């Protein structure tokens with residue numbers, strides 16, 4: 207017998223669990239022998255209102271040829287838009303795009319600026335800096351709000367974000383690193399905002415600390431009790447600073463997985479050698495369909511021989527799950543991992559990824 211690391215279980219309210227299969231199934235398959243969520247952004251995204259568009263919204267770029275996208279957040283029309291260049295030339299938005307993009311007789315060219323959406327690449331001749339996007343008028347037919355996306359395509363200034371893990375569970379502390387880089391300039395950042403957004407739109411704000419002039423660390427406790435149903439969480443951050451007369455604005459995102467520890471593995475023992483059968487004790491908090499997956503491994507070459515999977519419906523309480531391999535001596539074999547999946551969450555809720563020699567079972 208081998209005792210596995212303890213993991214207190216946590217119950218969750220599941221809406222789709224009743225629809226899951228109640229079939230007790232065992233599968234086996236042959237097999238043979240992402241690490242980081244680091245993400246860089248060369249632009250930013252923001253939500254703006256029609257009231258802000260009327261007054262004018264700052265579009266800040268650091269290099270020529272930035273790409274700008276304006277989409278309504280309601281199923282309504284976009285206003286006729288104007289853009290003020292950094293040299294205070296007021297233009298119809300279309301006149302800030304190339305002659306090619308303004309031409310309706312190219313055919314292959316998309317009608318990139320319409321009443322439904324507006325997308326453009328700023329002509330390199332207009333340079334870079336502070337552009338002002340403004341509405342020509344306001345009516346009760348335009349959308350209330352818009353998503354502005356700015357890709358500063360040819361800027362060497364980027365925002366780098368990452369979390370200390372790809373996967374978390376209920377009660378874990380998440381740590382994020384947020385850094386603003388340019389290999390020529392050293393920035394001093396003070397205006398930073400960051401949060402965690404869940405699949406149902408639930409928000410967990412990050413508590414930030416300044417590590418360096420351009421580096422921030424953020425922490426939060428992940429304590430959502432909701433089922434993510436296979437969907438992921440995102441770290442969202444927004445940074446703004448100034449370097450001389452230039453606005454440095456970057457926003458970034460990175461994904462991470464989250465689960466509720468709805469069930470845990472406790473003890474694993476070898477039941478038989480012919481056929482190679484193992485039994486694992488499981489503590490279940492929420493009635494759902496669970497799958498226990500394991501891999502049999504074999505100077506010396508270590509390689510997987512077969513994967514086994516036991517999937518069944520489990521009510522709250524203690525259970526014994528059985529899994530078998532086809533098959534070599536006990537000394538030349540070991541269990542590569544012990545993973546437990548909750549199909550109600552479509553997440554691994556328990557995993558032991560350390561080798562377990564059969565001589566320990």
Ligand SMILES: [Ca+2]
Pocket residue numbers: 397446
């Ligand atoms: Ca701000």
